[PDB]
From a paper:
Aerolysin is a β-pore-forming toxin produced by most Aeromonas bacteria, which has attracted large attention in the field of nanopore sensing due to its narrow and charged pore lumen. Pore-forming toxins (PFTs) are important virulence factors of many pathogenic bacteria, which are secreted in a soluble form and upon host membrane binding, they oligomerize into transmembrane pores undergoing a complex structural reorganization. Domains 3 and 4 form the 120 Å long 14-stranded β-barrel, with each protomer contributing two antiparallel β-strands. Four distinct constriction rings, two at each end of the pore, were identified from the structures and confirmed by MD simulation.
We have recently demonstrated that the K238A mutation enhances the sensing capabilities and sensitivity due to a longer dwell time of the analyte in the pore. To unravel the structural basis for this improved performance, we have solved the structure of the K238A mutant in SMALP obtaining a density map at 2.2 Å. The structures of the WT and mutant in SMALP are highly similar, exhibiting an RMSD of 0.92 Å and comparable pore cavities shown both from the raw structure and in MD simulations. Upon closer examination of the mutant structure, it becomes evident that the K238A mutation induces widening of the third constriction ring. This is attributed to the substitution of lysines with smaller alanine residue. In contrast to previous suggestions that the K238A mutation alters the analyte dwell time by decreasing the diameter of the constriction formed by R220,13 these structures reveal that all other constriction rings remain unaffected. Notably, for this mutant, we did observe a narrower water density from the MD simulation at R220, which is the same as previous MD results. The new structures indicate that the K238A mutation may influence the pore’s rigidity as it disrupts salt–bridge interactions between K238 and E258 within the barrel. A comparison of the ionic current response to different voltages revealed that the MD simulations in DPhPC bilayers based on the new K238A aerolysin structure solved in SMALPs yielded results that very closely aligned with the experimental data and are better than previous estimations, especially when negative voltage is applied.
Numbering used by the authors:
A (entry chain A), B (entry chain B): 1 to 9, 27 to 245, 252 to 422
Write the structure that this text describes.
């Protein structure tokens, strides 16, 4: 009838979340529900049958949805892309601690450095290629099984959601200009009315292609020979062959046209030019910063949140998208909202994290992890071997 | 929290520039910072731990950004491209000395001639192909290890940023004209209204292509023969083959059309012609002159600014772009502004140059190297085997 969330705890509603109810009770115990039905615990394999007992299950008269709250946006002082990234990853209260706690709650081992006993303390930050890496400091020494195998938090693939009325760009400059082709010409009007029916068009195209082929074959031959000085021989033969091909191509095209309106009893000159050149220009906008978050390290033997709950301390890697929806495996909100359907629990078990830490705890942590970020952006565009053109209509000459 | 620039000198802020702080202190020394944390010097490998000591690190209460200043533009008397280049490279106060000092500060050996002891003096200037070369004069003799291996400063790849309302061009002339094709025709209107539904179009296309193929193969055969006068033999065989192809093409197209409006009960004649010809014309504009600067010579054993600090006197080459941003390796402003992030110091160490010469010194030198230049330009366009066309609508004839 209604969706039921196990953290809040009808024969059907009981069946819909059967494995959660059966998990949360003693072996050989029996507890009741509506209309004379009872749930049997482990050892009876969770069987639901008509019956009676001295314990019962029941929902709150007024239960809650348990959704992740939305916080106000975090404003980062303006700059270029790398400066804004620097300011985000070095913020311990708004970035480093919430992310460390998320990794800890999901079951990643050793989230922290050697100079503190607390989660998220004593972390080092470094720049690595186009991304950033946050890991606990490992100077001196530690004490614990595999205590030198720290969990790493990796940040990459930043993207920007612009505000439509904020974008601006500056001067466009060109360098290393090379000529492709030019055309010049005249449009002549010896009639008594204006004429607009003229057209000159110049077009340039380039393309590439590839192909691969596999061939297989068989043949059979029979020869009979008779040496009557004179030998006479006759050969009969046949063959079969099969072949298979795959391929493809890519094409780029650039066209320019001119269509002048010419006054009566007059003529107009025209010109079109095409070059290749490198293009550069500055820009600015205001936007929201989204990114990919990857957690990497071995999981804990005493318990973790992976839905198969492995116990051999495997090394683990998983990527979440902090921002708009792309996919199910990488969406925290998708997985949180659907925790009432056992058939979709394919990645992380969020019911387990609620049981271990409390509902308010998990809600506040996830709200901080998913908080929006605002920042101003300045930057520079640059590209090699692009196109540049020029189309001209000149002044008329009376005939 | 905040970016910290080492020339101006929190446990995190301390970690963000750890290698600069540790470099700038004595082995086995320990100095303090905020909230009970201390930095250990070389020999402790820079370890940051809780503790105490008799020395401390601290930032200025009011530190500076240290950005490179912008100077007013240098005006060069007008001419053509080569005359303006000549005037730029022969200016010792605005060009030769600042560039020589930049090469000297980065660690290039022997920047100067044999008739002076000062940097940038006694330099010769020569024209070489499409560029210019500036090098210290090596007449007579010198005194020093490899003192005859002078550092060279090379200038090439000039580009112009026009002022939109300044461009003008003159007469367009043609020579070596060869006919491609012509068409003539009539548009006839025997209706009682004007008609504009007429079209004649002439189009000419040319193209080239190429392709390469690699093929490999295997075969196996078995023959049985029996010589019962009569020999009978039977052959069974099979084969396999694999092939791979790559290719491409280029196409150029030029089209011309005519669409006349014809009065009622009248006719109009039309004509289209297409030629190949060489095209020439004069031009003028006002613009800014940008260029590529290349430094070439062996580096100094006692210290240089390359980030790996090599000590075997290698021969070195590096190109900077003086002008708008293209890339990171060739941008002085990009590298200067990001000197607070150790993970991006991949080319020249600008913190090292500041430590060796002072901050005001480096700022003034780089401001002079990057100063804008304004100049007027006159010139001539020339190209072979271009297109030229002519489209004509004639006077009407009553029917």
């Amino acid at each position: 009838a209604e969706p039921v969330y196990p953290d809040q705890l009808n024969r059907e509603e009981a069946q819909s979340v059967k494995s959660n109810i059966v998990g949360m009770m003693g072996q050989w115990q029996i507890s009741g529900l509506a209309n004379g039905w009872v749930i049997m615990g482990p050892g009876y394999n969770g069987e639901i049958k008509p019956g009676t007992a001295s314990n019962t299950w029941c929902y709150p008269t007024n239960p809650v949805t348990g959704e992740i709250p939305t916080l106000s946006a975090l404003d980062i002082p303006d700059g270029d892309e790398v400066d804004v990234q620097w300011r985000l990853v070095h913020d311990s209260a708004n970035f480093i601690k919430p992310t460390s706690y998320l990794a800890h709650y999901l079951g990643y081992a050793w989230v922290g450095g050697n100079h503190s006993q607390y989660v998220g303390e004593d972390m080092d930050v470094t720049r690595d290629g186009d991304g950033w890496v946050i890991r606990g400091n490992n100077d001196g020494g530690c004490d614990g099984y595999r205590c030198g195998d720290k969990t790493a938090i990796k940040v990459s693939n930043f993207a920007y959601n612009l505000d439509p009325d904020s974008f601006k760009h500056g001067d466009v400059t060109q360098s290393d200009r090379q000529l492709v082709k030019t055309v010049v010409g005249w449009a002549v009007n010896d009639s008594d009315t204006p004429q607009s029916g003229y057209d000159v068009t110049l077009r340039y195209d380039t393309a590439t292609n590839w192909s691969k082929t596999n061939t297989y074959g068989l043949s059979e031959a029979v020869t009979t020979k008779n040496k009557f000085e004179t030998e006479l021989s006759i050969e009969i033969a046949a063959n079969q062959s099969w072949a298979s091909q795959n391929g493809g191509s890519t094409t780029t095209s650039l066209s320019q046209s001119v269509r002048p309106t010419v006054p009566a009893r007059s003529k107009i000159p025209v010109k079109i030019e095409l070059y290749k050149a490198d293009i550069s220009y500055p820009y600015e906008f205001k936007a929201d910063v989204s990114y990919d978050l990857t957690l990497s390290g071995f999981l804990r033997w005493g318990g973790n949140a992976w839905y198969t709950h492995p116990d051999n301390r495997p090394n683990w890697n998983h990527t979440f998208v902090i921002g708009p929806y792309k996919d199910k495996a990488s969406s925290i909100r998708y997985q949180w909202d659907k925790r009432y359907i056992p058939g979709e629990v394919k990645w992380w078990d969020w019911n387990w994290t609620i049981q271990q830490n409390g509902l308010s705890t998990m809600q506040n942590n996830l709200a901080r992890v998913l908080r929006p970020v605002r920042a101003g952006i300045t930057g520079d565009f640059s590209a090699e071997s692009q196109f540049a053109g020029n189309i001209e209509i000149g002044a008329p000459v009376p005939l």
